[PDB]
Amino acid sequence: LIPIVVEERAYDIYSRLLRERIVCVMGPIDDSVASLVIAQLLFLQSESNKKPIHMYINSPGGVVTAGLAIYDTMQYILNPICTWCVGQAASMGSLLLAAGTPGMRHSLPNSRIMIHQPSAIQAEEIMKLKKQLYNIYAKHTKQSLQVIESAMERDRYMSPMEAQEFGILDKVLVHP
Amino acid sequence: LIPIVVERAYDIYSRLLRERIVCVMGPIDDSVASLVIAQLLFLQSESNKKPIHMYINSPGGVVTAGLAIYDTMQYILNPICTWCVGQAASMGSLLLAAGTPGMRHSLPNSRIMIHQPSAIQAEEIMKLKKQLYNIYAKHTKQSLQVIESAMERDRYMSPMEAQEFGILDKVLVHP
Amino acid sequence: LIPIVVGERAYDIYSRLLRERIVCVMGPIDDSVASLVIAQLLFLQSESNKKPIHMYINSPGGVVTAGLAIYDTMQYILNPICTWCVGQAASMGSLLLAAGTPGMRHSLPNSRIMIHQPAIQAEEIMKLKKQLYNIYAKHTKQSLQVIESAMERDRYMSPMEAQEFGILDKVLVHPP
Amino acid sequence: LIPIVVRAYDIYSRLLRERIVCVMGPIDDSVASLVIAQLLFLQSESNKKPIHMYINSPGGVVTAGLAIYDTMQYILNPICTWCVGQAASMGSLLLAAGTPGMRHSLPNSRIMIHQPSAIQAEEIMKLKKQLYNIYAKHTKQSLQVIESAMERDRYMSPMEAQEFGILDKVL
Amino acid sequence: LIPIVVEAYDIYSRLLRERIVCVMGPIDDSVASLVIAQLLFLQSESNKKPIHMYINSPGGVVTAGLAIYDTMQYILNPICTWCVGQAASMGSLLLAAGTPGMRHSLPNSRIMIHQPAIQAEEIMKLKKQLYNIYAKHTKQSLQVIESAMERDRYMSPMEAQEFGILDKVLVHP
Amino acid sequence: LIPIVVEERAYDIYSRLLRERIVCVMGPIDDSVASLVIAQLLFLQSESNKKPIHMYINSPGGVVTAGLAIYDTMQYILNPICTWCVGQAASMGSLLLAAGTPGMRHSLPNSRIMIHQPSAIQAEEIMKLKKQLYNIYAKHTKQSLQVIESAMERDRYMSPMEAQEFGILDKVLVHPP
Amino acid sequence: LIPIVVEERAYDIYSRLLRERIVCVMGPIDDSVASLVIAQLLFLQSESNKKPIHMYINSPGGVVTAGLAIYDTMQYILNPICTWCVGQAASMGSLLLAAGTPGMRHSLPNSRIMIHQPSAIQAEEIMKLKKQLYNIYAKHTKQSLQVIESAMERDRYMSPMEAQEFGILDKVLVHPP
Amino acid sequence: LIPIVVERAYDIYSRLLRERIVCVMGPIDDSVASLVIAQLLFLQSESNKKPIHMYINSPGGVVTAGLAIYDTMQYILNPICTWCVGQAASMGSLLLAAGTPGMRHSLPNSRIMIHQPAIQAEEIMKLKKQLYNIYAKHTKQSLQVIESAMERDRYMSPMEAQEFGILDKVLVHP
Amino acid sequence: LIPIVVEERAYDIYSRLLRERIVCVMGPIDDSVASLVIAQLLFLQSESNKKPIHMYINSPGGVVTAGLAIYDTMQYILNPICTWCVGQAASMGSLLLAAGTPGMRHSLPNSRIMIHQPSAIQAEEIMKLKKQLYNIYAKHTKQSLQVIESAMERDRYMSPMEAQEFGILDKVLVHP
Numbered sequence A, I: 001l002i003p004i005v006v007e008e009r010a011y012d013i014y015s016r017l018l019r020e021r022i023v024c025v026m027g028p029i030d031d032s033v034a035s036l037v038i039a040q041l042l043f044l045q046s047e048s049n050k051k052p053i054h055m056y057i058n059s060p061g062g063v064v065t066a067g068l069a070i071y072d073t074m075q076y077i078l079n080p081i082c083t084w085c086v087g088q089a090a091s092m093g094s095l096l097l098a099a100g101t102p103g104m105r106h107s108l109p110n111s112r113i114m115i116h117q118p119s120a121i122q123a124e125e126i127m128k129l130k131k132q133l134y135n136i137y138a139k140h141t142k143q144s145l146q147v148i149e150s151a152m153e154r155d156r157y158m159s160p161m162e163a164q165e166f167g168i169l170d171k172v173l174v175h176p
Numbered sequence B: 001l002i003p004i005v006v007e008r009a010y011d012i013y014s015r016l017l018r019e020r021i022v023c024v025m026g027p028i029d030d031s032v033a034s035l036v037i038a039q040l041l042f043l044q045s046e047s048n049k050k051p052i053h054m055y056i057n058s059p060g061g062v063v064t065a066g067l068a069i070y071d072t073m074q075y076i077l078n079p080i081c082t083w084c085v086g087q088a089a090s091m092g093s094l095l096l097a098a099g100t101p102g103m104r105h106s107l108p109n110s111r112i113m114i115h116q117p118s119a120i121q122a123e124e125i126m127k128l129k130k131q132l133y134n135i136y137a138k139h140t141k142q143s144l145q146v147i148e149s150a151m152e153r154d155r156y157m158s159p160m161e162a163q164e165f166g167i168l169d170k171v172l173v174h175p
Numbered sequence C: 001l002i003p004i005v006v007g008e009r010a011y012d013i014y015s016r017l018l019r020e021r022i023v024c025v026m027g028p029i030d031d032s033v034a035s036l037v038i039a040q041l042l043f044l045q046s047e048s049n050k051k052p053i054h055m056y057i058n059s060p061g062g063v064v065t066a067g068l069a070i071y072d073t074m075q076y077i078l079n080p081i082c083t084w085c086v087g088q089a090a091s092m093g094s095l096l097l098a099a100g101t102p103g104m105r106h107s108l109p110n111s112r113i114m115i116h117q118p119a120i121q122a123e124e125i126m127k128l129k130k131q132l133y134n135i136y137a138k139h140t141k142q143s144l145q146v147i148e149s150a151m152e153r154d155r156y157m158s159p160m161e162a163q164e165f166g167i168l169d170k171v172l173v174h175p176p
Numbered sequence D: 001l002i003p004i005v006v007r008a009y010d011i012y013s014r015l016l017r018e019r020i021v022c023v024m025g026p027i028d029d030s031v032a033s034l035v036i037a038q039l040l041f042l043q044s045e046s047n048k049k050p051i052h053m054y055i056n057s058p059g060g061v062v063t064a065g066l067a068i069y070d071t072m073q074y075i076l077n078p079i080c081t082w083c084v085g086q087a088a089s090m091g092s093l094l095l096a097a098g099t100p101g102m103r104h105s106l107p108n109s110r111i112m113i114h115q116p117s118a119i120q121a122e123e124i125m126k127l128k129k130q131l132y133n134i135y136a137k138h139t140k141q142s143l144q145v146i147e148s149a150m151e152r153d154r155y156m157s158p159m160e161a162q163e164f165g166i167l168d169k170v171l
Numbered sequence E: 001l002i003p004i005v006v007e008a009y010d011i012y013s014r015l016l017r018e019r020i021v022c023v024m025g026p027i028d029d030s031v032a033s034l035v036i037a038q039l040l041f042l043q044s045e046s047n048k049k050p051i052h053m054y055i056n057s058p059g060g061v062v063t064a065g066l067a068i069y070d071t072m073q074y075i076l077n078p079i080c081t082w083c084v085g086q087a088a089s090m091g092s093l094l095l096a097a098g099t100p101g102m103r104h105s106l107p108n109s110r111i112m113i114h115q116p117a118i119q120a121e122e123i124m125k126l127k128k129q130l131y132n133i134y135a136k137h138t139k140q141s142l143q144v145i146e147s148a149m150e151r152d153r154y155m156s157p158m159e160a161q162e163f164g165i166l167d168k169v170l171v172h173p
Numbered sequence F, G: 001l002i003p004i005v006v007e008e009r010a011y012d013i014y015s016r017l018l019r020e021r022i023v024c025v026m027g028p029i030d031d032s033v034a035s036l037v038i039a040q041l042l043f044l045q046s047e048s049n050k051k052p053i054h055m056y057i058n059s060p061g062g063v064v065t066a067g068l069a070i071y072d073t074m075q076y077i078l079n080p081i082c083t084w085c086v087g088q089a090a091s092m093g094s095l096l097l098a099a100g101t102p103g104m105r106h107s108l109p110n111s112r113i114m115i116h117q118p119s120a121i122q123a124e125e126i127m128k129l130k131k132q133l134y135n136i137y138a139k140h141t142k143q144s145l146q147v148i149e150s151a152m153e154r155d156r157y158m159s160p161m162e163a164q165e166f167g168i169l170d171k172v173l174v175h176p177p
Numbered sequence H: 001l002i003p004i005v006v007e008r009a010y011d012i013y014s015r016l017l018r019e020r021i022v023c024v025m026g027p028i029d030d031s032v033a034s035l036v037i038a039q040l041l042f043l044q045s046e047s048n049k050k051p052i053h054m055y056i057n058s059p060g061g062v063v064t065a066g067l068a069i070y071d072t073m074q075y076i077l078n079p080i081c082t083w084c085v086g087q088a089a090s091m092g093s094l095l096l097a098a099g100t101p102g103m104r105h106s107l108p109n110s111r112i113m114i115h116q117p118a119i120q121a122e123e124i125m126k127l128k129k130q131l132y133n134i135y136a137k138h139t140k141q142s143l144q145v146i147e148s149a150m151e152r153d154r155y156m157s158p159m160e161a162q163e164f165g166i167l168d169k170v171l172v173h174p
């Protein structure tokens, strides 16, 4: 039941959010989510490839290759990407969260962050995908492999404060 | 089916938004939180001084979805008037009591519940309950001790007991 | 499929009903119906807080706390509210019907009215059931004990007994 | 789904511009509120010009049908009821409540006043007397003649239903 | 599921050997058919020895409960009805149809005579059957029975006993 | 579950009923209700060509062809059959009720009896079947076709006492003679 | 999804059909098929009391009362109506086919036409309805009752050419005249 | 599914009945209650002095189904030993507390709840009062203590429950 | 489709297993499983309370209070209890496995053992139950609390060899 706003043109509030260069990553990440997000990120680059992009994550995770789709598009565009976590970023959600422009990775105070991966393909393939997750997290947290994979074994959430200290985000904000 | 009102014409819900009114109706999940946060943010983009009104008629919902609203309420600058209609239970009463002080209201016949009624580990659930304990104590001026024994009783309060406990400031019959 | 009716503007018939300052409470009552009726009632009060609103009730009841949100918004707003019972008004429907302005509570001749009531602790259900007694007591101008007695009988009233009981003021057949 | 005719309407809206109100299929609360809407809307447009209720229905919720009956009886306009296909149970009630000399059916229609088979038992009998009464009113038959007929699980043809008092014209 | 006792029966076959007939939960044609069979068997074994009918039911199909009620009237034995838990709607009409003086409840039972695809005249007709049955066994007047069944509520064993539904309320022998 | 009773010998209560030459017609009658009922009419006749059988009927009706199968077995076998109506006998239930041995058809007092037929084949075939019911009911009630055809058009129930006056049964009994 | 076509003005293809005074009876006919078809017979008549309307029929039948509603609208309105059978017209479909203006009822070559009625109400009421279909078919085919009643008892389809010789239609066309 | 033991050959549940052991397992409905009440009537016909053993591992159930069991336990003359295993919650703990005084037992790890989780609001409140009074009776607590307790959405330990009046002993072994 | 064996009496093979004093704990543990197991363990004690009892665990876990029911009955009976793990013992399964008589806790070579708890009650209650699990495991593994709870956080299985070394079992056997 999505509301309309005027600005004189008239958009629904989500079209409006994308006009402010805000892309939502809200919920379980599947291919068509990934498709929406990728579409938006590439449209904002076309508008201005130096102007920043804010991406808002409230995601329990999802389909791993769909998330890497987003992640890869993040790495590709020319824009700074402020990532913001509200509610939670678990599994691929905090992967996207940890993959913002350094210095521009934010959570609100009561957010919950998980890098552990909640548990139809071959066994070695899953391990392959799981190393990919291990290196991406190592890249952006500036942590070691063995630290990352020990960490990813703890079935557990962090506070915005621990996640900052671990390298997943940069600033925990209450106010602007 | 949602009616149109009327010089251009919005559906009634779009028109509630022009009043700076954000409805939080029913159970709270992430996509409701997405809708509420967007409006809060947009309403602050419109003026960051002009108040915002949050009509809460909710039984609770996903804790982190509700926290994403609570946090966003705290983030924005505007005075936030919160309104309880029918009932605000579990996460929905956290929100109701998070409105800016002296600006939390109930219509007379509502019911208010801070009891949390009832896939993660038991150490994580408990971490989340602790976060609720602290929010509630922060906004009702009550001690954690008072907050926990109270949240332990499976009961509703009238808007008056609510106002006395520190969830509400006003109860009113009319403007 | 809702019909359209017709400077010159074009309305679906239900908006048109709201232009006439009519709000409908058709069928069972839940939070989303209540959101809709409160939205319409607060809007009508904003277009004129002295002009009457007409509220049409054909309803078998509903969620109590959702029904009370409607009742309280009736009592809040500034406008005279003339209620009309068509078809039936049982439980919360009859309470909305009985909570129009004194002397502007109507039924058409064949309506059936019920004040008998068809997960929460047992003490909260009695708390709530007592709020119902207090509201019916108020507007029907009947004693508490008489309300509690009446609400124990699993029966409907004629629009003429409910006139007689306190629930409505006039039974109309044709327009005055 | 639904075509568009030429200013442009959809056909069911174009019909309403013609002062025509369909009653089509089973009657429930939302049929009734849609029908009562149109009836009021039409009388607001003119209280002298007749309205046309096209009924093809096997009935429905008694209270929902009673709601439409009363709205008919409230509004001032002459009302021409039209039976098409069938008007059975509640449907036949409204058909019979068109204003006199204006109740029609088409030749091959079927008309039933037998009421085919959660509230208390006394409250069910109360509702049935209401229809007994409503029917006796508009057919000018007696209550003993209404209840007897209402017990025979059967249709009448338009001519049977004309002699009974349900309608006036068959074409 | 059902345990086996020696004396070799299932426990419910052994209740029947004790002349105990359970009427558990909702009445329908199947339940009624069962019950009636045991009632005729028991009489066939002896038309003088009582039969203990154990009732704990929210009611059921009217026609089916009436088949039971009729069977009860037919057979010669004194029938001791026992309410455990609850007897509502039809369940409490059988309770009332025990032999006078041997209608019992346990302390915490609940008793209800209020009643929760056929025609209106027929639903009223069956309701008058219930009216007259209840009036006969409570010795209460018709008009007292109908007021009663309209109040949607339960009676405690002692209000059920002051009304003529049962006779005795036992905490223990 | 079906209790077991002792006799020296163990029977489940329903088996021990058949021992009494009692046959139960309980519930909707389909082809396998009919099959099981016919199985025991034929059986009970082979235990005695002349000892009376008892049908306990509590039924709201059923498949017409499955009902007529039972009616026809009932007509075939040589046994006097006493019918008993308990709870109800509507539609084909009441036809099995009416078809007991003249003067052996009974109701308990509180039973409800209906002969109206409540609402894949062609149209001529349903009127074929309706007519067959007319003639069966006409036969045993001793009523005229005309009277059967309109009584059945009244969607209503008869008391055991009106059913006795119409012809469906012969005695309404409260206690054992 | 329904394409849009341009005319200056945009119509979805089905709307633009109605513009040609074409009305489609496609599929099972229930009360709301009938309602929408009647809506456009009445509409097209009000655009012209005498210009011919075209019913395209491809239907396997439907609710008899809903069919007879359409038949009756078709009889009411003053317009000459050309019927066209495409794919099939079985049961009430073929009755709407037969009821076009004499000599305006058509089939394309490969259509299949059935008048047999493939297999809640009482029995007298279904024979009531069957008889009404007998008289409608009798009327427009110009066949006797006796002939209609047995043709309809044959569970079978007719070619457009046999249907033309029976009376259901008048012309079987391959290309436009 | 259910095994046979030899002694003569019972299924293992039939053999527990021969020990005078009545099992109240899982949610209590009128059917559980039928089975339980049957067993208690029978076991008393065997002897009205020999103790009955009610093993309870139950989350709760229908209240009238529960009170039928309770009333049957009051009716019979036998000393009843109640034992709690896994848990006894809502109606279950009510049965646990209702065994013969000095004979109510829990295993060291059981959890006990007296908090309760179509009829009118005056019936529920009538039923709840009835739970209030059974409980008050059997824990020697007051009504006020009992009512406030049942309002806390919480389980107790077996020692807690022992201190409160719900049970007498807590045994790791015999 | 359970087979019968003769021994001359004739039992199904599972009745036969219980005659050899073998009780299976096979699969998800719910109240009626727990009831079966408890029944069997108490019947074997009645036969001989010094003769050992072998309990065979292939369980992914289950309802925690139902498992403690079994555990408590284990602690209660007088008999030695050899526990044997085949396939897997995860969550409450390895709790029962770790709760055998010391010296009599066995796995086959390819078994998989989990003490981590795969993830409708109050929050503090779940923590209470979870401390119970923490102490029981500490009791029988002779490990510390902090070691146990760190361990229970690793979403992960052990080999019969690691589980022995950790204190969950005593012997890993290939042959008799």
Ligand SMILES: N#Cc1cccc(CN2CCC3=C(C2)C(=O)N(Cc2ccc(Cl)cc2)C2=NCCN23)c1
Residues within 6 Å of the ligand: A038, A039, A042, A043, A046, A072, A073, A076
């Ligand atoms: N899925 C995926 C994926 C993710 C990251 C990078 C790429 C590579 N593509 C190659 C083609 C390509 C790219 C980048 C591109 O961004 N623009 C500019 C553009 C795109 C969208 C919008 Cl709305 C407006 C302007 C473009 N314009 C035409 C061809 N083209 C693909």
Ligand SMILES: N#Cc1cccc(CN2CCC3=C(C2)C(=O)N(Cc2ccc(Cl)cc2)C2=NCCN23)c1
Residues within 6 Å of the ligand: A016, A017, A020, A021, A022, A054, A056, A057, A084, A086, B037, B038, B041, B042, B045, B071, B072, B075
């Ligand atoms: N989920 C979440 C969450 C909740 C609270 C606070 C934040 C932090 N963000 C930072 C980025 C950011 C924020 C707040 C922001 O309010 N506007 C202004 C704005 C927003 C919507 C509309 Cl329609 C119009 C204007 C904005 N415009 C560009 C960058 N930007 C995120």
Ligand SMILES: N#Cc1cccc(CN2CCC3=C(C2)C(=O)N(Cc2ccc(Cl)cc2)C2=NCCN23)c1
Residues within 6 Å of the ligand: B015, B016, B019, B020, B021, B053, B055, B056, B083, B085, B107, C038, C039, C042, C043, C046, C072, C073, C076
């Ligand atoms: N749910 C609930 C509920 C039910 C009854 C009473 C209230 C109290 N609120 C206080 C705030 C408040 C109220 C009433 C108010 O009526 N208008 C005027 C207005 C509202 C909507 C529209 Cl479409 C047009 C004009 C308003 N404009 C900004 C703030 N505001 C809430």
Ligand SMILES: N#Cc1cccc(CN2CCC3=C(C2)C(=O)N(Cc2ccc(Cl)cc2)C2=NCCN23)c1
Residues within 6 Å of the ligand: C016, C017, C020, C021, C022, C054, C056, C057, C084, C086, C108, D036, D037, D040, D041, D044, D070, D071, D074
């Ligand atoms: N359900 C019901 C029911 C059935 C029959 C009679 C009534 C009584 N009401 C009184 C209020 C009332 C009525 C009739 C009324 O016809 N119009 C005129 C009107 C209505 C609809 C439209 Cl689209 C346009 C104009 C009106 N305009 C302001 C308030 N109002 C209610």
Ligand SMILES: N#Cc1cccc(CN2CCC3=C(C2)C(=O)N(Cc2ccc(Cl)cc2)C2=NCCN23)c1
Residues within 6 Å of the ligand: E036, E037, E040, E041, E044, E070, E071, E074, F013, F016, F017, F020, F021, F022, F054, F056, F057, F084, F086
């Ligand atoms: N349904 C019904 C219904 C309900 C109440 C009363 C009756 C009347 N019937 C008549 C036939 C009849 C009756 C009573 C009868 O009790 N016994 C004795 C008997 C019955 C069952 C068993 Cl297991 C053992 C012995 C009997 N033996 C042969 C025929 N017969 C029928």
Ligand SMILES: N#Cc1cccc(CN2CCC3=C(C2)C(=O)N(Cc2ccc(Cl)cc2)C2=NCCN23)c1
Residues within 6 Å of the ligand: F038, F039, F042, F043, F046, F072, F073, F076
């Ligand atoms: N369906 C059907 C239906 C219904 C009624 C009548 C019939 C006709 N059949 C003819 C053959 C036939 C009949 C009757 C027959 O009764 N017995 C004797 C018998 C039958 C069953 C049992 Cl258990 C014991 C003894 C018999 N024994 C051998 C051949 N035979 C069929």
Ligand SMILES: N#Cc1cccc(CN2CCC3=C(C2)C(=O)N(Cc2ccc(Cl)cc2)C2=NCCN23)c1
Residues within 6 Å of the ligand: D011, D014, D015, D018, D019, D020, D052, D054, D055, D082, D084, G038, G039, G042, G043, G046, G072, G073, G076
């Ligand atoms: N269902 C049915 C059914 C089927 C066939 C015939 C009839 C009888 N009615 C009588 C009233 C009536 C009729 C025919 C009529 O055709 N027009 C003209 C009209 C209709 C619709 C449209 Cl879109 C445009 C113009 C009309 N305009 C006002 C009253 N009126 C009913």
Ligand SMILES: N#Cc1cccc(CN2CCC3=C(C2)C(=O)N(Cc2ccc(Cl)cc2)C2=NCCN23)c1
Residues within 6 Å of the ligand: E011, E014, E015, E018, E019, E020, E052, E054, E082, E084, H037, H038, H041, H042, H043, H045, H071, H072, H075
């Ligand atoms: N539900 C219920 C309920 C609960 C508690 C008390 C009662 C009252 N009845 C009275 C009749 C009665 C009772 C108790 C009784 O215990 N025995 C002895 C007996 C019972 C079962 C078995 Cl397996 C073996 C022997 C008995 N034998 C004949 C009459 N009779 C009913």
Ligand SMILES: N#Cc1cccc(CN2CCC3=C(C2)C(=O)N(Cc2ccc(Cl)cc2)C2=NCCN23)c1
Residues within 6 Å of the ligand: H015, H016, H019, H020, H021, H053, H055, H056, H083, H085, I038, I039, I042, I043, I046, I072, I073, I076
């Ligand atoms: N659930 C639970 C649970 C778990 C552990 C311990 C207990 C305590 N009970 C007390 C009563 C009790 C116990 C132990 C007992 O083992 N036997 C001996 C016995 C048991 C079963 C069988 Cl098949 C054969 C002999 C006994 N015989 C009669 C009373 N009785 C309960």
